[PDB]
Structures are given as structure tokens and as C-alpha cells.
Design a protein around this ligand. Structure first.
Ligand code: ATP
Lengths: 337, 437
């Protein structure tokens, strides 16, 4: 309702009203339902195929504010309705219609040659948004008539499987909305009112959807298993590539603190290819799904090293060691974040 | 006390409107417009210098303008684009995914700046007051920063014409260089033309073709009549590489590196003409006979270029020279030029070679074989360790760099059973001051 209706949008809304009536009659005649006073599937009759005046005025108005909300949603999302060619507006041509496509009444269902215009990936994006919005409209109506999701179909319990988000929606309904919007938007493009959707914005959503305060979980061996001296090897297998840190930690590591932020632990981050100890700097290479990381530490030489798929990871510098020098302290234990 | 009494303080003025989406107000937009407008002003300044150089008033009335341009504008372009390569290079393919994708209009303006700088540098080295190195560095860096796909898909027809005309002018100038070298072995205007070529024209083309091949934007950068411009460039470069003169010899290296870059970048297998029928990227296939006749084309894929021979013929020549054991002093030109272009073509067309795509058979652009690359590598290594005792050159390292990608594509094990005998045969002549990997 925030979007206002300009006079040009009104005059093209008239043409889109003839568009929608022509779409009604063309869809009905193509699908096979005949023309009838009452919309009965068993009788194969449709006032939609009949003229809109004989069509019930409640359906006429419902589809009129249907078109109105569609146009205002296009404007709100970011398209700017604009007239391209006065000659294109003036010229109106009917598509060649076979006898079967010909409707029972005399209102020939032809806005223009829709096949003339070409298609844009932005047009696909905004048509998909229109279909998602229309499915939301139907679902919201069904909610306020009390319909709920159900695996089977029962009018008595008002349960319908199609009351699901458009992502999980069935291909039949998706294709119905898709071809309806194909026809509508192609007709509007034939009119010349191209819909200039806004450009995509560069952003990192960060996929931060974890419930409550915890953002990461730290797994470590028992403190009693700390290694004071010697040469030790253990493997960390990453099933999915992402935010992981693997390395060696002191027994005083705090579970709430992120690995490698402080002096508690030494860690390797494959997501950003950065080794972590009291800060980060670029080291090694990013792993992939299924990779294995081998953590190697020499307490005698105070040298600690990492591998990815059996290859020694390297700094930006030529030094092979992940961490050159560190006091032995009270020993290290394996850890992952 | 305001807080305690409850009176809530807000800003003095609520924002009336945010003009954030518009790109014209952005700093990069304004800086690029500023740079372009100053470059164009310097362009008509140099036009006035063309009109007055023969005239009495040689001294610039716009002396401050020219000196400011040379001292500030060019180094500023250099440093800015060197520091911010990634911002322009990002083309929604997510380089530096944190942020900084350049506007399409800004990419168009970058390309227009490149065209304007090329037009300015064209045949004006003597006009530039020793700032020729700075200008060619600007062309180099800007060509590195150029983004081809975004401009080709969405860009102004004037920008298309500017880039196309820059490449056409470069092709015509280098063709004229080849023809005047051929007709006159001597060295005036021809001397200044060859100086322009060797100093600026070969570097800009080499850098642009290297970048365009590396980013694989040549596919849409060179399609129609710019493809035949590239044909002229390739013919002229190969004819100069095979050409038989002391000046062309002292410019072995520039022409050789340019030819290698062109082999890497060019999207039609000129070495394998007979097998290009299935390739859609061939300009003959795209044009059809009517467009071929409309342009200046022999209509024969094999006879488009007489000087370049068959790829199999080149390979037989390489293997027979390797068997005969020729010297670098005796016969330098092929060894400097042909092997780099052959390796670059090798590497570029291994992707279309049937090894990567055994499916979709006989639509492979070139029938490239592992034994084919391994035989080429054997010939190259044979020749280099034979010329090792012949006082060699820096083309040792040059050819090592040129053939490293071929080694990368070659299997480890398939390379072995020849590598170790070859490696040791290099070892008992590796006892020289320069080492080869
Ligand atoms: N002739 C038609 N026959 C069936 N559905 C039609 C027809 N014309 C339009 N539609 C629309 O197709 C969709 C398919 O109907 P669907 O069974 O999914 O829901 P519904 O009948 O509106 O509600 P309910 O959840 O009670 O079944 C509906 O949005 C309906 O309005």
C-alpha cells in the first residue's frame, strides 16, 4: 500500500487488465475447459473463459487487485516502469490463432507477439520473486481461512501439502506460476514497459544461524595426556570445508575463547589459510572437503609443523615451521575448534 | 539530567535522502573522469604540438600543462592502478570476495583511458619529453587492469570502437614496420617507426595478450574483424620472427615474447588449420562465405597465412634439428622464437586436446597427445644441453620458463623413464655457471 499508482501505471494497468482477461480465456481454451456461467471442473465450464463481465465480479476484482499488488511489488523490489516506444504502444498485433486456440466467445486472446521480445537473467530473478510472492499470498489466505500443512490432503482437517515455503514447493505449482509469469512479463515487455530490476549488492551473509551464544565448539584431549618432550603426530579429517582450527593447545585453554586468539593454543585455520597464535597471519593453503591435516610437533627442538594431504604447509616466507620457538611450559595437547 | 527527566535527545537533522546507489558520486568514478579529462586535454595539447612543431612556436604555451601531466598524472595512474588492480579486475567472479567490485561504467572508463593512452603514445616517443618509459608503464599496468568480458557484454559502442581501433592501429603500424624492414634493409621516419615498435608497441601487445590469455577473456574480446586484425598481427609477428636481419636479431627477444603471448592468447588454432572446421570460434565458421567476401579473407583456413606452416611440419623440423644437433650461433631465430610460441600454443590447446575431453570426439580443436608434449620437451631439452657447450645464452632461462607449463601438464611418471636419463645427461653438462632448474 506504500506504493502510489501513477497515471501512466494506471493506463498500462488498463491494458494489463485486457491482458489478464485474454490470459484467462486463452488458458481455459488451451487446457480444454469450455465456457460456462459457473466455474465447475466436472462440468468443464469457466466464466473465466467467458467474458469478464459475465465472470463473477468478486473474481474480477480479486484478479484486478492481484495485478495491482503485482505491479506495486515490482516497483517496491526495485523495477522502474517506463515507456520505451510510443510506436510500440500504438501498434497492437494479434498472434495467429488456430481453431483449437480460438475461444468460444469473440474476444480473441492476443495482446501482442510475445515471442518477439527476449529474456533477461534479472527478469528471471524478478519473475521468481513474483512467483514466490504469489505463493506466499495464497498461503497467507489459506492461513486466515485456517488451512495448515499436512502430508496428505483433507478438506475436513484443512491440511494441504502445498502450504510450504516456495523452496520446497512442488514442481507442478512452481511451473504454473512460472508460465503464468512468463506470459505476463513477456506481454509487458512487448508493450515496451521493461522492468529494470536493481543491481545485486555484494555482501557476506556469514551463515551465522547457530542457536544461542555458542559459535564454535572446542574438542581437546585430557590434560593428563600432555606431552612434555618428544615427537608427536595426529591427524584431523575435515568432512566439510569451513571454519575449523586444528593444532596443539596448552592445558590452560579456555573453551569460550577462540583458538589461537591468545597464548593458550597454537592453531591452523584452513578456511582463511592462516595460522593462529596471539593473532593470525597467512600460512599454508585452504583445504577442501575430505582433506586430512597432520599436526606434527617437536618439543625437543620447539618446532611445530602441519600438513595438508601429505604436503608440508608453507608460510608466505620460505620457513617450513608453523611456529619457530615456544617455551615448553606444561606440555601441549591435541585440540580442534 | 536530560536522561533522568526523560527528555530523549536525537540528531539535529534527520537525513532527508541517501544518494548511495548512484555510482557517479563515487570517488573512483570522479577520479577516473578526472584522469580521462586531463588525458584528453593533453591529447589536444599534443595535437597543437603537432601543428606547431614544424612552426615557429615550438615552446609550449601549455608548458605548465604538459610538465604537470608528465610529472604527476602518469605516475599517479601507475601507482593507483598497481595498488588497486583487484578492484577493477573483479568482474562478479569473486576475486577479493570481501568487497570492491568495480562498476561496469568505471570499467568502461578504464578501457577508454587505455585506448586514449594508446592513441597518445602512438608515434609520439620523440614528442614525449623522456616520459616515454612512464607512458609505456602506464599502458602496461592499465592493460593488466583491463577487464574485457564486462565491457564486451555491457559497454558503450564508442568504447568498442576505441579498443578495436587501437588494436587495428597497432596491427597496421606493425605491418608497416614489417614491410619497410623487408623493402629496406637500411636502419628517418622508418627508424622512428621501428623505435616506436621495439620500445612501446611490442611491450603493450605482449602485456595485453598475456593478461587476456591468462584471464581467458580473449574469447569475447576478439571475435569479429578484431579476429582478422589479430590475424594480421600474427602474420607480421611470424614473418618478423622468421625474418633475416641484424636489427630483427637484436630484437629476437621482444618479438619472441610477443609471439609466445599471442600463441597463448589467440583463440583459433592457427597451427592446425585443417581441424578448425568444427571449432565455432573460427572467424571463417562464424562469418560464412558472404561475410568472408565482405571482409578481406582468402576463404581458405589453410591459406589464411602462408608463412606459418603446418604444426606437424614444425614438429618434424624441431625433431630433425634436435637429431642433427645445431648450434645457437649458427641458427638462432627459430630457437629463440618458434619454441616459445610452440609451448604457449601447447599449453593453451591442451584443454581442447582429446586427453581432457575424450568425449565429444573429433570436435577437439587440436589432436594434442601426451607423447606429443613429451617429444616436444625431449627436443627442447636436447637442443638446450647441446647448445650448453656452445656458450649458450639467457634463452636458456627464457626457454626454461616457456617450457615449464609443458612440464606441468606432462605426467610425472610419463615424464620419467626419459626424465632421469635426460636429467643426468644434463648433469654431466650441468657444470656451468648457470643452472637450469
Ligand atoms: N481452473 C483452475 N483449477 C484449479 N486451480 C486453479 C484454477 N485456476 C486457478 N487456480 C489456482 O491454482 C492453485 C491450485 O489450487 P490448490 O489446490 O493448490 O489451492 P486452493 O484450491 O486455492 O486451496 P486449498 O489449499 O484449499 O486446496 C490455486 O491457487 C488456485 O486458485
Amino acid at each position: 500500500s506504500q506504493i502510489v499508482l501513477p497515471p501512466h501505471l494506471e493506463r498500462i494497468r488498463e491494458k494489463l487488465a485486457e491482458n489478464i482477461h485474454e490470459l484467462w480465456v486463452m488458458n481455459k481454451i488451451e487446457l480444454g475447459w469450455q465456457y460456462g456461467p459457473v466455474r465447475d471442473d466436472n462440468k468443464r465450464q469457466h466464466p473465466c473463459l467467458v467474458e469478464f463481465s459475465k465472470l463473477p465480479e468478486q473474481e474480477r476484482n480479486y484478479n484486478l487487485q492481484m495485478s495491482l499488488e503485482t505491479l506495486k511489488t515490482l516497483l517496491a523490489l526495485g523495477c522502474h516502469v517506463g515507456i520505451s516506444d510510443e510506436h510500440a504502444e500504438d501498434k497492437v498485433k494479434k498472434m495467429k490463432l488456430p481453431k483449437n486456440y480460438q475461444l468460444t466467445s469473440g474476444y480473441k486472446p492476443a495482446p501482442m507477439d510475445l515471442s518477439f521480445i527476449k529474456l533477461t537473467p534479472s527478469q528471471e530473478a524478478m519473475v521468481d520473486k513474483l512467483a514466490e510472492n504469489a505463493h506466499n499470498v495464497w498461503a497467507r489466505d489459506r492461513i486466515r481461512q485456517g488451512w495448515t500443512y499436512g502430508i496428505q490432503q483433507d478438506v475436513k482437517n484443512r491440511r494441504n501439502p502445498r502450504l510450504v515455503p516456495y523452496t520446497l514447493l512442488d514442481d507442478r505449482t512452481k511451473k504454473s506460476n512460472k508460465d503464468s509469469l512468463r506470459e505476463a512479463v513477456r506481454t509487458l515487455l512487448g508493450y515496451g514497459y521493461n522492468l529494470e530490476a536493481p543491481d545485486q549488492d555484494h555482501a557476506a551473509r556469514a551463515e551465522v544461524c547457530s542457536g544461542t551464544g555458542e559459535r564454535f565448539r572446542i574438542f581437546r584431549a585430557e590434560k593428563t595426556y600432555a606431552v612434555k618432550a618428544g615427537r608427536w603426530y595426529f591427524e584431523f579429517e575435515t568432512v566439510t570445508a569451513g571454519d575449523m582450527r586444528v593444532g596443539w593447545s596448552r592445558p590452560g585453554c579456555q573453551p569460550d575463547q577462540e583458538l589461537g586468539s591468545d597464548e593458550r593454543a597454537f592453531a591452523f585455520d584452513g578456511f582463511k589459510a592462516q595460522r593462529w597464535h596471539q593473532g593470525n597471519e597467512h600460512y599454508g593453503r585452504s583445504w577442501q572437503a575430505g582433506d586430512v591435516v597432520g599436526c606434527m610437533v617437536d618439543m625437543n627442538e620447539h618446532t611445530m609443523m602441519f600438513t595438508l594431504n601429505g604436503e608440508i604447509l608453507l608460510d608466505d616466507s620460505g620457513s617450513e615451521l608453523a611456529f619457530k620457538d615456544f617455551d615448553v611450559g606444561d606440555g601441549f595437547i591435541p585440540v580442534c575448534s | 539530567f536530560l536522561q533522568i527527566n526523560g527528555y530523549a535527545v536525537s540528531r539535529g537533522f534527520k537525513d532527508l535522502e541517501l544518494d548511495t546507489p548512484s555510482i557517479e558520486k563515487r570517488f573512483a568514478y570522479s577520479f577516473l573522469q578526472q584522469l580521462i579529462r586531463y588525458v584528453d586535454e593533453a591529447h589536444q595539447y599534443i595535437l597543437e604540438f603537432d601543428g606547431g612543431s614544424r612552426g615557429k612556436g615550438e615552446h609550449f604555451p601549455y608548458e605548465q600543462e604538459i610538465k604537470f601531466f608528465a610529472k604527476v598524472v602518469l605516475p599517479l595512474i601507475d601507482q593507483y592502478f598497481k595498488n588497486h588492480r583487484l578492484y577493477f579486475l573483479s568482474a562478479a567472479s569473486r576475486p577479493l570476495c570481501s568487497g570492491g567490485h568495480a562498476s561496469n561504467k568505471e570499467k568502461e572508463m578504464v578501457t577508454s583511458l587505455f585506448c586514449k593512452l594508446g592513441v597518445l603514445v602512438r608515434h609520439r616517443i620523440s614528442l614525449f619529453g623522456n616520459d616515454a618509459t612512464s607512458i609505456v608503464n602506464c599502458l602496461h599496468i592499465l592493460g593488466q587492469t583491463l577487464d574485457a568480458r564486462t565491457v564486451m557484454k555491457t559497454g558503450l559502442e564508442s568504447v568498442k570502437s576505441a579498443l578495436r581501433a587501437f588494436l587495428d592501429n597497432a596491427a597496421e603500424d606493425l605491418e608497416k614496420t614489417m614491410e619497410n624492414l623487408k623493402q629496406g634493409q637500411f636502419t628517418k621516419g622508418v627508424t622512428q617507426i621501428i623505435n616506436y615498435t621495439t620500445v612501446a608497441l611490442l611491450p603493450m601487445l605482449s602485456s595485453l595478450f598475456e593478461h587476456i590469455g591468462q584471464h581467458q577473456f580473449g574469447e569475447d574480446l576478439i571475435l569479429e574483424d578484431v579476429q582478422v586484425s589479430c590475424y594480421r598481427i600474427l602474420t607480421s609477428l611470424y614473418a618478423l620472427g622468421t625474418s633475416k636481419s641484424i636489427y630483427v636479431e637484436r630484437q629476437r627477444s621482444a618479438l619472441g615474447e610477443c609471439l609466445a603471448a599471442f600463441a597463448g592468447a589467440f583463440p583459433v588454432a592457427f597451427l592446425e588449420t585443417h581441424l578448425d572446421k568444427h571449432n565455432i570460434y573460427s572467424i571463417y565458421n562464424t562469418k560464412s562465405s558472404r561475410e568472408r567476401a565482405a571482409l578481406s579473407l582468402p576463404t581458405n583456413v589453410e591459406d589464411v597465412c602462408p608463412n606459418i606452416p603446418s604444426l606437424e611440419k614444425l614438429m618434424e623440423e624441431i625433431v630433425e634439428l634436435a637429431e642433427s644437433g645445431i648450434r645457437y650461433t649458427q641458427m638462432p631465430h627459430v630457437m629463440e622464437v618458434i619454441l616459445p610460441m610452440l609451448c604457449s600454443y601447447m599449453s593453451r590447446w591442451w584443454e581442447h586436446g582429446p586427453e581432457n575431453n575424450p568425449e565429444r570426439a573429433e570436435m577437439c580443436c587440436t589432436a594434442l597427445n601426451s607423447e606429443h608434449m613429451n617429444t616436444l620437451l625431449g627436443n627442447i631439452l636436447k637442443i638446450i644441453y647441446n647448445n650448453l657447450g656452445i656458450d649458450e645464452g639467457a634463452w636458456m632461462k627464457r626457454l626454461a620458463v616457456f617450457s615449464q607449463p609443458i612440464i606441468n601438464k606432462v605426467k610425472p611418471q610419463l615424464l620419467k623413464t626419459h626424465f632421469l636419463p635426460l636429467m643426468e645427461k644434463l648433469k654431466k653438462k650441468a657444470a656451468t655457471v648457470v643452472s637450469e632448474e
